[PDB]
Amino acid sequence: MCDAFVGTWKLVSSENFDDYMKEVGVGFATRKVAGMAKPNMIISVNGDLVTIRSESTFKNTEISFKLGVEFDEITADDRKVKSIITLDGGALVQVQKWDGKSTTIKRKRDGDKLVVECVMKGVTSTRVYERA
């Protein structure tokens, strides 16, 4: 399950992430620190349970979830959201909802890369990772 995604992934490019975080409502100071962080993303699977960690000097976070089962999450920027993650077309698609708002984070394998596209109200950021 989700075999392709398993690994340790290091950030290699980031496009439009500051504007994405502005749209989400992340504060100035936090955007500054989060933008200069170069997180590793560590994805593992155990039976039907998927775990994603994001590790950086900014913060360490971890979510554990089942596909297609809504779960509560505190994000790196301290939002309390309801999240649902699904496998569609080989991409892992995460929707976060809070306070009448919504954002989508898509993680797709493209060659030897993991491409992460984050969208909120038509503002899109793209972050590309490769295996560490």
Author numbering: 1 to 132
Which statements did the authors publish about this structure?
Fatty acid-binding proteins (FABPs) are involved in the uptake, metabolism and intracellular trafficking of fatty acids. Based on epidemiological studies and animal knockout models, the isoforms FABP4 and FABP5 were identified as potential diabetes and atherosclerosis targets. The aim of this study was to develop a dual FABP4/5 inhibitor and, to this end, high-throughput and fragment screens were conducted with X-ray crystallography as a follow-up method on those ligands that showed appreciable affinity and favorable physicochemical properties. Structure-based drug design (SBDD) based on initial hits from high-throughput and fragment screens yielded 216 ligand-bound structures of human FABP3, FABP4 and FABP5 isoforms, many of which were at resolutions of better than 1.2 Å.
During this exercise, 229 FABP crystal structures from various human and mouse isoforms were determined, many at better than 1.2 Å resolution.
